[PDB]
Symmetry: D2
Subunit: 328 residues, 4 copies
Amino acid sequence: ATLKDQLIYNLLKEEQTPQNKITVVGVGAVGMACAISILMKDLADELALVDVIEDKLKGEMMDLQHGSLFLRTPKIVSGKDYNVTANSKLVIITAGARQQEGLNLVQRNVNIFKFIIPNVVKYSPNCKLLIVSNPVDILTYVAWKISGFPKNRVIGSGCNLDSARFRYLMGERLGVHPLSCHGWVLGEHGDSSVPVWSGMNVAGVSLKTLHPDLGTDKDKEQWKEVHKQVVESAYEVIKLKGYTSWAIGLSVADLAESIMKNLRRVHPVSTMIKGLYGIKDDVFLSVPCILGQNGISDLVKVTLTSEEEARLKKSADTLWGIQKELQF
Amino acid sequence: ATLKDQLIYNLLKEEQTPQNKITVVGVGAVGMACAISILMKDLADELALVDVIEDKLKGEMMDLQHGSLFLRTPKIVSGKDYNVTANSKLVIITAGARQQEGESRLNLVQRNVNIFKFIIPNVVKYSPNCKLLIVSNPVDILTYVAWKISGFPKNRVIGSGCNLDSARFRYLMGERLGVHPLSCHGWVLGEHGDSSVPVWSGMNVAGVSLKTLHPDLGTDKDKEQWKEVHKQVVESAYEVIKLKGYTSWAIGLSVADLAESIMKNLRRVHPVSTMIKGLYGIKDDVFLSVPCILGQNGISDLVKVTLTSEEEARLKKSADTLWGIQKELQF
Amino acid sequence: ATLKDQLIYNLLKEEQTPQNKITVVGVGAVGMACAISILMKDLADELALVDVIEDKLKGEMMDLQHGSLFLRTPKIVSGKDYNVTANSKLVIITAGARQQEGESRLNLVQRNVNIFKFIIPNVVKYSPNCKLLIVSNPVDILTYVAWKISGFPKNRVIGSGCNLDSARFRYLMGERLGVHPLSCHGWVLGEHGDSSVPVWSGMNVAGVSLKTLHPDLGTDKDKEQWKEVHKQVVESAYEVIKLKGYTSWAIGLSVADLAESIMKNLRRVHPVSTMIKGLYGIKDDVFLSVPCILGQNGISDLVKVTLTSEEEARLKKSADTLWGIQKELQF
Amino acid sequence: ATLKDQLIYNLLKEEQTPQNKITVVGVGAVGMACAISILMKDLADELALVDVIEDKLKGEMMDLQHGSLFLRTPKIVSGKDYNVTANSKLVIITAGARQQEGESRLNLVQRNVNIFKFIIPNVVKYSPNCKLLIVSNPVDILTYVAWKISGFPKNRVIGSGCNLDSARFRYLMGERLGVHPLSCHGWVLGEHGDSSVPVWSGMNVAGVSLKTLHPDLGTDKDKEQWKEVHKQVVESAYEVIKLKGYTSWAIGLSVADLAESIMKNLRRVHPVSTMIKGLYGIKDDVFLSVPCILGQNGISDLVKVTLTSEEEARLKKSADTLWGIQKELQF
Ligand SMILES: NC(=O)c1ccc[n+]([C@@H]2O[C@H](COP(=O)([O-])OP(=O)(O)OC[C@H]3O[C@@H](n4cnc5c(N)ncnc54)[C@H](O)[C@@H]3O)[C@@H](O)[C@H]2O)c1
Ligand SMILES: NC(=O)c1ccc[n+]([C@@H]2O[C@H](COP(=O)([O-])OP(=O)(O)OC[C@H]3O[C@@H](n4cnc5c(N)ncnc54)[C@H](O)[C@@H]3O)[C@@H](O)[C@H]2O)c1
Ligand SMILES: NC(=O)c1ccc[n+]([C@@H]2O[C@H](COP(=O)([O-])OP(=O)(O)OC[C@H]3O[C@@H](n4cnc5c(N)ncnc54)[C@H](O)[C@@H]3O)[C@@H](O)[C@H]2O)c1
Ligand SMILES: NC(=O)c1ccc[n+]([C@@H]2O[C@H](COP(=O)([O-])OP(=O)(O)OC[C@H]3O[C@@H](n4cnc5c(N)ncnc54)[C@H](O)[C@@H]3O)[C@@H](O)[C@H]2O)c1
Ligand SMILES: O=C1N[C@@](c2ccc(N3CCOCC3)cc2)(c2ccsc2)CC(O)=C1Sc1ccccc1Cl
Ligand SMILES: O=C1N[C@@](c2ccc(N3CCOCC3)cc2)(c2ccsc2)CC(O)=C1Sc1ccccc1Cl
Ligand SMILES: O=C1N[C@@](c2ccc(N3CCOCC3)cc2)(c2ccsc2)CC(O)=C1Sc1ccccc1Cl
Ligand SMILES: O=C1N[C@@](c2ccc(N3CCOCC3)cc2)(c2ccsc2)CC(O)=C1Sc1ccccc1Cl
């Protein structure tokens, strides 16, 4: 009688759970950039989008849904209720408080996490959490605390963007693609990030071997300025357009690729360092991690210099002082 | 010797011309969505970005540049000067003005013509052998404005047209039949937007015509009301603006799909705004969406679609309305 | 301590069960072409390869393993034992016997049935919730053999069928019209090979029916010889074997396109061999190609194609031709 | 009129030349693996295939052509005449002779030099601005033969070299450390094959040097036996030929990775055979693998690798060895 019945003959209507589902909590500039990066890389069969703002959330879901002809993602869902996030493999939290004062920004984000994290674990208890929101190093700890998930399943964006920006500026200087420009920025994400000058190489040849003054004050070519420009460019983007979207979105997708496909690639991501670099407190800092289907299965022990080790410990001390005064 | 000289031994420093360059004029919500869609599909070796707002332009260029580690595009450039657009294979114009509550349609068209009177001569100056891809609204009128100022042959002036209308229609057809929009073949033609004409005869799944099985398809006396599908296409477009304020992702992905066919010379059929003078009883220099074979030469060929008397009448009515504004335009 | 212990600090050693695993039974020209097509499309996290010839199997596994730097597939396994196939989501059977001089159709199919009497119980033993994708010839008969031995529901037993016939047809239609095969919509149904039925009504470009514009389409009395398009499909298949000895790339790419729809739950329509008992006056348990909606549950739905009396009779003839062999099978 | 005239209305009949053409000389196991790797990575708009064997060449061209529905490459051409190779951006030479039973190594070299005396002048005739990518063995000697006959600058004559050695090494390093070969940085330089030199100082994971926290790395005094990693690279290459008879997938994927950097001007570092004269105390016109920055101009730059006395002596021995054959060549 109906055209659907006339045209299509159904064999079975059985309901089945998505095998490769990804949830994005926060539909901001970052959240949407992560979403489009994932859809275009064909990492998910189902994409769930969650936010507090109901109108923007429906609009963003619809805009992605209209472009479904050019995407290999059959299902794109949204809602205020986390029942839409059910059976998700990876959950990306980009949800954060608006920077206007009037509790502080760190205190506001913890409260936001106080209802996201229990709601996500409720529908997706075997997922891997990917924290993007700032302070990423503190919030990854807050996520780990509330979820009660093992250390490995709580991954933080960390210094993935710092290293991506550093490899670009290293790339521009040497006139080589950032993929061939190997450089690692570790520790606390942002201003307090530690560039590992010993690790800096192109084709296996160490840049500190050829140039011993690399990352020092007596560097005539002043290579210490490369890491200075990383921090400066981050403040420049906010001054020029108001937000960072594409660079972070693409980085999150690169982590999502390693997790969803069990690639076992090394990435600079925020993880628990309790037992390494003389750190005894429950603090999360970026170190090179082997990322797969189990989250952080392994972490690379990087030989740091006395000054690098003192910087990571200073961060570990300043971070724990904040974390110990956090109420749940 | 410097570290670069110590580490790398240069064989040649011969600065060559980019073989697959794409310029995006307008760094708005649409422009940026097109940019990221192109970069992720690896369609260009060089991407040029142009806008009037200098601050936003530098910020957007830098944000894409930082993500270069995850992209296969070595060069991303920007600037107010069009010298950055030199030797482009494709130029996407997303530059436009925002209509006000106390503003006439003809005024808006003129404002966008004044914007185009600055862009089009500047683009042809540095890229005379490029293909123009117009996104700005009214697309059908602005593709004609671009064609007149550039003096480019009709094939090299392509307009987005009903590419998004069709994409939205195939999605809603897809969700109703429970099949992927790629397997849901449907064509929306003519004037982009409200006046768009859905071709019900062309509407099929696996080659089987939906009008054949259901003759009341698209008719006012339909039991299932398949007219609601095209009605929802227009309604959803107004809904997105009401809910978030702009459309970005859907259009950006569609522009990249056109760009893929142009940049790779695929010769796939797409519903794009082209010179319609000669067919369906149209005598005026009007641009309307018809299925076009898109390649390296732009619109090399166009598909002759058998339209019904009502569909053909809807096409003339739009051609008459578009020409009405077109004759009242200042160059 | 070891260098691995010195360099890397382990958090957990507990390995998870394969999530998106694909098994390829038969490491022949077809099997390897399927394997490389899947790996390059990044459809599997683990790829299992099975064959009777243990030497070639190890060599092929190693050759793919060496190229792992350029692939997004972390695990590539092989072995004579099917314990390597455990927890596979899709199993592609390309295992077959080679056609001999002075051999009966009943004789060749039974040699392949014996091969299947060993494979099918061994695959279900380790992967009971998988989807079987049959490639080996006669594909329409061996999909039925697979369905009977496995005891799997009709949806989980998919046969390659007329996916290659349609791909070849859309290419020849494409070359003639000077348009990309993706824009050239054509459906070849029924029994895969010589007895394949081209659906001339379904043949279109941009929704416009080629039978409508040209009523002589597919008839021997056509001056443009559009019936020669399907004749050239059969002729090219025999030509490839005459010129190189086997078909590999075309079939391999088609299998991956089916795999993409299954592994990603795309719900795209494909011409695949399925249990057609009940449709087009067919009463026997015969597998024939019809457009199917392919997803994570295998064949969830099938498209009811309006066939002409000549097309229906050809399909009915193939059903009788296949059942003649099927009822004579000892298994 | 015709169905093509009825369906498609032509705007222009302009003949189009390929912008991104790739030619593959040799349609063997390697040649075909390169071809399918390139097509699936969407690196070319036109693919040209040439070989001496006319039958196999037509069969292989047709098999790829049939799979065009699943590929983004509109044109696939073949022929004995090199007029089909005209205006190529990259030419991959996989054409070779196989060592006969009574034949010596020196006899095999001259036979390939004779094969090259016919190919290289014919390729430069139609594609004088192309980049040659030689795969055929001995790669280090035949890249020199190609460079001498073509008269092309050293940057436009690229040899596969140790790209496969490094890919195999990074896989075995990867398996040992339980990390993806992409995160396992290791460089094998010099003469491709048995005489290849592994750079133990360069060996790292996340920037941390493996020679630093394991000083016995690559020496006989090693308890863990990391010397065997490179010895297994050689062993596995001989194993693949013993088990299946040829190497195809691993090399084809590596060739496509080089092609990606050339065709897209990525400027990525790769271990490829280049004119080493003037470096590491080498005075002869010898080609050896060193890390090269690969772009649209071929080898624009080299990476100066700090080699140990034994590594540097190993490289100058291979350069003296290769020249011993090269001076005795007749062309
Ligand atoms: N880790 C990095 O390298 C990095 C880089 C860039 C940005 N960021 C961070 O990303 C975060 C967001 O950036 P943005 O540009 O998307 O900002 P935004 O303010 O536009 O996005 C925040 C979104 O979170 C939503 N939200 C608030 N409370 C929520 C809740 N309880 N549940 C769900 N959603 C909720 C808001 O509605 C808003 O859409 C910031 O904290 C920023 O610091 C991190
Ligand atoms: N054709 C379609 O289907 C379709 C779909 C969606 C949007 N659109 C159109 O896209 C256009 C832009 O949408 P948006 O969201 O990017 O809007 P927006 O207003 O944010 O973008 C317009 C941009 O153009 C720039 N611009 C203005 N004058 C310029 C000039 N002389 N040179 C260069 N740049 C200039 C502005 O600085 C601004 O960044 C609108 O006209 C809209 O109607 C078309
Ligand atoms: N359906 C189509 O459109 C289509 C197209 C092309 C080829 N094919 C079919 O694909 C099949 C194989 O083609 P090919 O080129 O790979 O031929 P082939 O003879 O080289 O491959 C057959 C492989 O199956 C293996 N095999 C045999 N018995 C086995 C067993 N019991 N378990 C596991 N493996 C076993 C053999 O060792 C051999 O490697 C043929 O039946 C051919 O007709 C089908
Ligand atoms: N560089 C590496 O790392 C590497 C790795 C693997 C293989 N190879 C080399 O690749 C080469 C070929 O391997 P294959 O498996 O393709 O072998 P094959 O013998 O099957 O292929 C050789 C092809 O070259 C063709 N040919 C011969 N003379 C020709 C001519 N004058 N013009 C055009 N084509 C001609 C032959 O017809 C044949 O098809 C060998 O030399 C092998 O050593 C190199
Ligand atoms: O984590 C980051 N946060 C950002 C950032 C700032 C504000 C907002 N919003 C304000 C407007 O509303 C939206 C949220 C969003 C993101 C940043 C830039 C300078 S300080 C912090 C953007 C950015 O670039 C990085 S990375 C970074 C930061 C500092 C130093 C070094 C690095 Cl790598
Ligand atoms: O061309 C379009 N234009 C849009 C549109 C784009 C930008 C802005 N800005 C104004 C505010 O500033 C930001 C830009 C406003 C509207 C539209 C939506 C309803 S009427 C026109 C968005 C859209 O979806 C289409 S396609 C379309 C439109 C109408 C009917 C049917 C279709 Cl398919
Ligand atoms: O199913 C097929 N089988 C093939 C085929 C035949 C023999 C072998 N060998 C196995 C390995 O040993 C050598 C022979 C492998 C494949 C074929 C070609 C002409 S008749 C059947 C190849 C092919 O192209 C199709 S599809 C097809 C066939 C006939 C008509 C139309 C179509 Cl679409
Ligand atoms: O260059 C190579 N050549 C191969 C090879 C390629 C083609 C053929 N034929 C093709 C079929 O006809 C017969 C000849 C025979 C051998 C090889 C294997 C052991 S010695 C040389 C295959 C291979 O794997 C490498 S790389 C390599 C070789 C030795 C040591 C280390 C490495 Cl990385």
